[PDB]
Amino acid sequence: XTPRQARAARAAXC
Amino acid sequence: XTPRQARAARAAXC
Amino acid sequence: XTPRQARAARAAXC
Amino acid sequence: XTPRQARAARAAXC
Amino acid sequence: XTPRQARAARAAXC
Amino acid sequence: XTPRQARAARAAXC
Ligand SMILES: *Cc1cccc(-c2cccc(C*)c2)c1
Ligand SMILES: *Cc1cccc(-c2cccc(C*)c2)c1
Ligand SMILES: *Cc1cccc(-c2cccc(C*)c2)c1
Ligand SMILES: *Cc1cccc(-c2cccc(C*)c2)c1
Ligand SMILES: *Cc1cccc(-c2cccc(C*)c2)c1
Ligand SMILES: *Cc1cccc(-c2cccc(C*)c2)c1
C-alpha cells in the first residue's frame, strides 16, 4: 504494497 | 519505496 | 534486514 | 516468493 | 533476489 | 515481519 507501507519502507531505507 | 515501485509491487502481488 | 527495519516492517504489516 | 515476483522486484530497482 | 533467496523466503512465509 | 522471519532474511543474505 500500500502507499502507507511504501512510505514506511522508504523511511526505513529499504 | 517510490509510489512507482509500490505500484509495481501491487501488480506482482508482493 | 536490520532489527530496526524489521520492526518498521512489522509495524506496517510488511 | 515466486521467481516472477523476484524478477519484478529487480525490474523495479528494489 | 536469487532463486535460493526466494526459496528461503517461501520457507519462512515471507 | 516476525523476529523469526527477520532472522531468516538475514541468514539468506540480508
Ligand atoms: C512490498 C514489500 C513487503 C515486504 C518487504 C519489502 C521490502 C523488503 C526489502 C527491501 C525493500 C526495499 C522492500 C517490500
Ligand atoms: C517496497 C518496494 C520497493 C521496491 C520494489 C518493490 C517491489 C516491486 C515489484 C515486485 C516486488 C515483489 C517488490 C517494493
Ligand atoms: C513494507 C515495509 C515497511 C517498512 C519497512 C520495510 C523494510 C525496510 C527495509 C528492509 C526490510 C527487510 C523491510 C518494509
Ligand atoms: C514476494 C516479495 C515480497 C516483498 C519483497 C520482495 C522483494 C524481492 C526482491 C527484491 C526486493 C528488494 C524485495 C518480494
Ligand atoms: C526477496 C528476498 C531476498 C532475500 C531474502 C529474502 C527472505 C528470506 C527469508 C525470509 C524472508 C522474510 C525474506 C527474500
Ligand atoms: C519482512 C520481509 C518480507 C518479505 C520480503 C522481505 C525481504 C525482501 C528482500 C530482501 C530482504 C532482505 C527481505 C522481507
PDB file of N, CA, C and O in Angstrom, chain D residues 1-3 6 10, chain E residues 1 6-7 9-10, unseen atoms left out:
ATOM      1  CA  UNK D   1       8.318 -15.515  -3.022  1.00  0.00           C
ATOM      2  C   UNK D   1       8.528 -16.226  -4.348  1.00  0.00           C
ATOM      3  O   UNK D   1       9.420 -17.070  -4.400  1.00  0.00           O
ATOM      4  N   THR D   2       7.687 -16.004  -5.405  1.00  0.00           N
ATOM      5  CA  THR D   2       7.840 -16.780  -6.673  1.00  0.00           C
ATOM      6  C   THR D   2       8.984 -16.198  -7.505  1.00  0.00           C
ATOM      7  O   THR D   2       9.370 -15.055  -7.292  1.00  0.00           O
ATOM      8  N   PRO D   3       9.521 -16.970  -8.467  1.00  0.00           N
ATOM      9  CA  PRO D   3      10.510 -16.402  -9.396  1.00  0.00           C
ATOM     10  C   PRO D   3      10.029 -15.133 -10.125  1.00  0.00           C
ATOM     11  O   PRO D   3      10.816 -14.203 -10.327  1.00  0.00           O
ATOM     12  N   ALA D   6      10.244 -12.132  -7.706  1.00  0.00           N
ATOM     13  CA  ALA D   6      11.646 -11.730  -7.565  1.00  0.00           C
ATOM     14  C   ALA D   6      12.133 -10.939  -8.790  1.00  0.00           C
ATOM     15  O   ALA D   6      12.794  -9.901  -8.644  1.00  0.00           O
ATOM     16  N   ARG D  10      13.341  -6.879  -8.964  1.00  0.00           N
ATOM     17  CA  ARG D  10      14.603  -6.459  -9.565  1.00  0.00           C
ATOM     18  C   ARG D  10      14.373  -5.493 -10.729  1.00  0.00           C
ATOM     19  O   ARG D  10      15.095  -4.505 -10.870  1.00  0.00           O
TER      20      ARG D  10
ATOM     21  CA  UNK E   1      16.575 -11.715  -5.087  1.00  0.00           C
ATOM     22  C   UNK E   1      16.923 -12.934  -5.941  1.00  0.00           C
ATOM     23  O   UNK E   1      16.347 -13.084  -7.022  1.00  0.00           O
ATOM     24  N   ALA E   6      14.695 -16.537  -2.744  1.00  0.00           N
ATOM     25  CA  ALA E   6      13.246 -16.654  -2.893  1.00  0.00           C
ATOM     26  C   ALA E   6      12.728 -17.940  -2.241  1.00  0.00           C
ATOM     27  O   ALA E   6      11.671 -17.946  -1.613  1.00  0.00           O
ATOM     28  N   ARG E   7      13.482 -19.027  -2.391  1.00  0.00           N
ATOM     29  CA  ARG E   7      13.150 -20.292  -1.742  1.00  0.00           C
ATOM     30  C   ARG E   7      13.178 -20.167  -0.216  1.00  0.00           C
ATOM     31  O   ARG E   7      12.297 -20.690   0.472  1.00  0.00           O
ATOM     32  N   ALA E   9      12.702 -17.360   1.420  1.00  0.00           N
ATOM     33  CA  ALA E   9      11.547 -16.514   1.740  1.00  0.00           C
ATOM     34  C   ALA E   9      10.275 -17.356   1.846  1.00  0.00           C
ATOM     35  O   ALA E   9       9.527 -17.246   2.822  1.00  0.00           O
ATOM     36  N   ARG E  10      10.057 -18.240   0.869  1.00  0.00           N
ATOM     37  CA  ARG E  10       8.915 -19.161   0.911  1.00  0.00           C
ATOM     38  C   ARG E  10       8.975 -20.059   2.146  1.00  0.00           C
ATOM     39  O   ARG E  10       7.952 -20.291   2.783  1.00  0.00           O
TER      40      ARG E  10
END
